């Protein structure tokens, strides 16, 4: 717990894999788009829902534009100078709850009111940034190492329950009347309300089930490998588009709003000095709560994306990441947008998608090399050496760790068997000798953040998405927030 020690160590570690990060990201060509698109959807949909929730709960002060811009800018800055580019930054539910509490507090004060809410929030963000700077400088993130696997599994389960509760609440609200829309409307009759609720159930469950099914496309006996990979990669975005199209089928026999549909930044510094100084000090309290929450969430989200099972080859940056989070919180407060923060399950989902990308790249390369070798000599031990050489050649040269390397050829595999091709199937055998590796780089995070930003200018296209799609996706992400963690497995076994 020495001042500035952790930050300096983290910077030392990360500054020697920076150009490597960028060149590795560019090494993959357009194949980097699949994880990028997957994480872009996973980041944009919850943020848009949170933006709608804040617009309803803040009388139009904060909308989806602000949440999207915060997510995009914070993500881009973290991608370029972050320290741990696996982390995905976004506006989380606890932030929404705290901002709702703050808005409710400020609406009941004649001194603050509604036209000074953003300025008071900015002062809260200044206090939070100061607290985060103090915590990072003192190495308070060292206690993160102490928290064990259960301390992260419980948080994952809590986030899963929160996402499921959000999905169920959205589905139930599809059955009720909104508190802001015109009450005397054709689309809001009890019969049409029941119809809307049932249609939303159909669409949400259809999206959930089809996406969960298409997530297993690669392990199918039908179709071609190209089509199987395309489905396994883009099924959830494709399902979003397909169920959006399905929602338009009955449009010739229903009222306008059946089903219900969805719908830069500025500065608040000038009016930030108009807040009386009894609430600038009073911002310390919600600032303390938000600082503790962010200290916990950023760290746990970063460590859940850095599981030992992924065999990552680059160091962690907990202290430096917390310092940068302080800076980003200060910037977001000055810009009048809610702060971003490391979020789950987006971060582990990003890590898993990158691991899958590396696995597929390696499988393609090794299959090609094995097929090339089968024709020439194919001695089954000289071909394994060729595959090992290709694996080593593909890898990126670093200084910290070394590539895991292909694992041992199983005794049963050799006992079963130049090499006879009838008795040695490459597709069956490659999977048995591929390690778990992650394609670590900064390009996927940067592109996902830029896409989230461009969603700001793509609002008319976003106007065509029903909210049932959002609730189905929230359920899909809640299930993704327990992708087979040890704690959930143990609960299943009991």
Residue numbers in the entry: 5 to 267, 278 to 431, 440 to 516
Excerpt from the paper describing this PDB structure:
Boron, essential for plant growth, necessitates precise regulation due to its potential toxicity.
The protein yields of these mutant AtBor1s were more than 10 times lower than wild type, but we obtained a stable protein sample from an AtBor1 active mutant (R637E/E641R/R643E) using LMNG detergent. The densities for TM13 and TM14 are disordered, so the atomic model was built to residue 516 from a dimer structure at 2.77 Å resolution and a protomer structure at 2.55 Å resolution with robust side chain densities (right). The putative substrate binding site cannot be accessed from either the cytosolic or the extracellular sites, defining this class as an occluded conformation. Importantly, our AtBor1 occluded structure resolved the large intracellular loop between TM10 and TM11. The phosphate group of phosphorylated Thr410 interacts with this positive pocket, which is also well-defined in the IAI structure, even though the intracellular domain is not resolved in this conformation. Further comparison with the IAI conformation revealed an upward shift of Lys372 by approximately 5.4 Å due to a fold switch from a β-sheet to an α-helix. This repositioning allows the side chain of Lys372 to face Thr410 in the occluded conformation.
